[PDB]
Amino acid sequence: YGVKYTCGACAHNFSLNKSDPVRCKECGHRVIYKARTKRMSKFLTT
C-alpha cells in the first residue's frame, strides 16, 4: 500500500518531501519517476 517516487534503474519505491535530498536508497543516480495514479483511468475500444 502506497508509493511516491521510483528510480530510473533500481525501481525501488521511495517517498520523500522537500530538503530530504533527491537521490535514492543506494544508487546515487538522481533521477526518479513519480509512479502511477490511484484513480483508475477509463478507455474506449476504438
Partner 1 sequence: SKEPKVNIINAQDDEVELMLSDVNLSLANSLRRTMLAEVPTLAIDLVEIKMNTSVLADEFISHRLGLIPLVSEDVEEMKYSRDCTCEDYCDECSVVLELSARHEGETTDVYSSSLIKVSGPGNLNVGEPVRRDDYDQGILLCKLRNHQELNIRCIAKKGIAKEHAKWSPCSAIAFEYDPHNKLKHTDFWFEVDAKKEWPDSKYATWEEPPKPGEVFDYKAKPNRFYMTVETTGSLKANQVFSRGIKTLQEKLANVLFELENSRPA
Partner 2 sequence: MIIPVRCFSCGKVVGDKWDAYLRLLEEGKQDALDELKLKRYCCRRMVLTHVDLIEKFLRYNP
Residues at the annotated binding site?
7, 10, 24, 27
Nearer Cβ to partner 1 (17/45) = 45
CA atoms within 13 A on the CB side of 41: 3
The CB-of-11 to partner 2 minimum distance in angstroms stands at: 4
Q: Of 42, 14, 43, give the one whose Cα is nearest residue 27.
A: 14
Sign of CA dihedral 27, 1, 37, 17: negative
Contacts with Zn ion, 4-43, as mask; x by CB under 5 A: ---x--x-------------x--x----------------
